[PDB]
Amino acid sequence: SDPSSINGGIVVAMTGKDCVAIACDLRLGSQSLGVSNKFEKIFHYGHVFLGITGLATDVTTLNEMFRYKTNLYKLKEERAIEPETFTQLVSSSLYERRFGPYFVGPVVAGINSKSGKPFIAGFDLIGCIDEAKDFIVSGTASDQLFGMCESLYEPNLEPEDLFETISQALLNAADRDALSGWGAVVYIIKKDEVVKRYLKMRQD
């Protein structure tokens, strides 16, 4: 009934030293029934990464929508969109559906190509921007993620250390949620290289 918890899933993002990390589980279900263990929730448009939790049809729809908009942005502007600008675009796009919203919990992550400054941001289903320094959480196990991140996180972590922190934050939070898990992916992002790692986790 509650659209935000039919399919289930989670996303978490963190900042480190000259790097950002964004991660998500791979589960897609119909309430109790697990349907797919390859439903990725992180997408990217150039060097800007977007994670989306919530109702899966809207996750897919928005991805297609932001691909549409960022492709036109690039043709006209003759440059790739930046995280700060994309964040405003996501907010604008969501609020235009104020009284008929997409049931999602987006999370933007990336590094500004000009300033080199790491950037993360979260939103509610209708566009409110949460621009945190430390971390952003989203999904059915957001409470769990808040508790993991708030205790595990420390500022200025190196890429390979940040990987361990965000991976353990996601994994242990998902294991306390019935509608999350079934695999996980972690993106480690630096100014001009991105590494994608699939995590080994319990499949129940």
Binding site: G147, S151, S167, N172, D175, R176, K200
Partner: protein, 222 residues
């Protein structure tokens, strides 16, 4: 319509060591968005080296604790001052809770102490009496924030040994009382940051063969 239940917030945490046990809980008491008290003790010494906390609706929690303390008193009278073992106390509490199965004590109960072999013990209850011995258990408002952290940092879940890459798990080495208290404090500091009903103060009751000791720590008051 009259609603006989309420939510007084708070959060509690029990951790069983090798030869000790702790039962912690914040001292904040609330209704809705108001603070009732910044220091309202929630974890109690019930005698016989048993500590108890009934988190949730404080009126039902105070009633239950009061009735269990009473049960300990009468257990001494009826059975020649015999010590009530933690396992026996747990079963007794199941019957207290299930006695009100159709008008429940709206509380998440936890007790802590030592078993009959001297090892640390924590028992966890749902509102209607189902119980289970556990090594680790958080209860109340911010339980969802704390338990995952404890799965990771107490039972070393999802943690493996470097170099093996997922093949060999991190070994389950025992934790000292000083190590547990660090995890308890960090749990409540983190919970206080992200949960509005958690804060003000942290009171920890530590149980050993020597008896029951108390420790208090300040928490953020916002």
């Amino acid at each position: 319509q009259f609603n006989p239940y309420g939510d007084n917030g708070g959060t509690i945490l029990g951790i069983a060591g090798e030869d000790f046990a702790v039962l912690a809980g914040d001292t904040r008491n609330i209704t809705d968005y108001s603070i009732n008290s910044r220091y309202e003790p929630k974890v109690f010494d019930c005698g016989d080296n048993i500590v108890m906390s009934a988190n949730g609706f404080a009126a039902d929690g105070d009633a239950l604790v009061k009735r269990f303390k009473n049960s300990v008193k009468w257990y001494h009278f009826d059975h020649n001052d015999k010590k009530l073992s933690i396992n026996s106390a747990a079963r007794n509490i199941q019957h207290l809770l299930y006695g009100k199965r159709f008008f429940p004590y709206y509380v998440h109960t936890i007790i802590a102490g030592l078993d009959e072999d001297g090892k640390g013990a924590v028992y966890s209850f749902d509102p209607v009496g189902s119980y289970e011995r556990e090594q680790c258990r958080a209860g109340g408002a911010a339980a969802s924030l704390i338990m995952p952290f404890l799965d990771n940092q107490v039972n070393f879940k999802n943690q493996y040994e470097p170099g093996t890459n997922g093949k060999v798990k991190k070994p389950l080495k025992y934790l000292s009382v000083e190590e547990v208290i660090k995890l308890v404090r960090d749990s409540f500091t983190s919970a206080t940051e992200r949960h509005i009903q958690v804060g003000d103060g942290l009171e920890i009751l530590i149980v050993t063969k020597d008896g029951v000791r108390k420790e208090f720590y300040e928490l953020k008051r916002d």
